[PDB]
């Protein structure tokens, strides 16, 4: 659509102008902070992990002794070297940002300290190449601080740990890095291998309603809750990253799909359900899934699968996945969508039930222009292709009225019910 194509550049220009640091291409502090604030809040995204704070040694000195232009060039030079080291860790993806000239950060949710230690050294070792290069004249180049943050730690709290690490690193004339101070690594292992075998995850449901008619329910997202010794539940956030460090994620989709598939034959409502990259990465349990889908031909209409915008395979494959699905009469959509159209290309070609907007963009839309603006930009470019839009993490009576002003299709979030277990 010659139309779509204009509105999908106009929307991506508007991402970059808003959330992209122009120099390095990395996220701006604004975006970054929106993520931290928005992740801690979210039971399914939080929050064990690590924080990287890097400050470059002697900004001022560098500017005098080398002048602004060759200084700017330098931070480009590190943006890169940061990304390069942070590739190995996917969770970090999209979370590498530059706060202030000379200072950058990476949120690495669900990161092992040992991983952190290794990351710092590799990064530190890699960072020095710049000095030799002639890029900087300070040999130590930059200071590296890694703060470990527990989940349930407020973002402000999380940042504060980071400042200490950087400072700790700074007060060290031997090395340039540091990290503050499992567990337990094997307890999680055993607890999880176990619960999977024993089919011991519960099915939680969150309502998704029409934005126009709040009373009108489009579908219930099925979230996951791990059980523990006392049938207490544990939320996707805490445990998910542990499935990954262990490779058991596909195990879960497979389970959580057998359970949904049965339970749906208890009623007639419409559901929605995650589908990991790790089930798509593997071709063995991936295909399992279609077979499960094939047997239950009947419910394809009532079920809808959901990938994270980050977890996408190649548009080439995606086309394959979206199609092979439609054949089974089942629907597909995207979640944690953040306007990276350039990545999809073939979107209008896919035939998605909808896109669920990462909700990091929703919180305080009424009150925060740049967000409201960026989304208006998006609905417009997905209106054209009659691809419905759903907002996650709507909590406030206000945020809602702004979406009705925006004419999005639908809403999900604390405002319409936390996730619970109704059938």
Residue numbers in the entry: 219 to 399, 407 to 648
Published text:
In order to elucidate the molecular mechanism that regulates LapD function, we determined the crystal structure of the intracellular module of P. fluorescens LapD, comprising a HAMP–GGDEF domain linker segment and the degenerate GGDEF–EAL domain module (LapDdual; residues 220–648). The structure of LapDdual (space group P32, one molecule in the asymmetric unit) was solved by single-wavelength anomalous dispersion phasing using selenomethione-substituted protein crystals. We also obtained a second crystal form involving different crystal packing contacts (space group I23, one molecule in the asymmetric unit), yet the overall structure of LapDdual in the two crystals is identical (root mean square deviation [rmsd] of 0.9 Å over all atoms; Figure S2A and S2C). In both cases, the biologically significant unit was predicted to be a monomer, based on energetic and geometric estimations. LapDdual adopts a compact, bilobal conformation. The GGDEF domain, comprising the N-terminal lobe, caps the dinucleotide-binding pocket of the EAL domain, which forms the C-terminal lobe of the tandem domain structure. The EAL domain buttresses the N-terminal S helix via predominantly hydrophobic interactions, burying 1,170 Å2. In addition to the S helix–EAL domain interaction, the GGDEF domain contacts the dinucleotide-binding surface of the EAL domain at multiple points, forming a loosely packed interface that buries 1,620 Å2 of surface area. One such contact, the salt bridge between an arginine residue (R450) and a glutamate residue (E262), forms a particularly close interaction. While E262 directly occupies the dinucleotide-binding site, the loop itself is located at its periphery, partially blocking access of c-di-GMP to the EAL domain. In summary, the structural analysis of the cytoplasmic domain of LapD reveals that in the absence of c-di-GMP, the protein resides in a conformation incompatible with dinucleotide binding, with the GGDEF domain restricting access of c-di-GMP to the EAL domain.
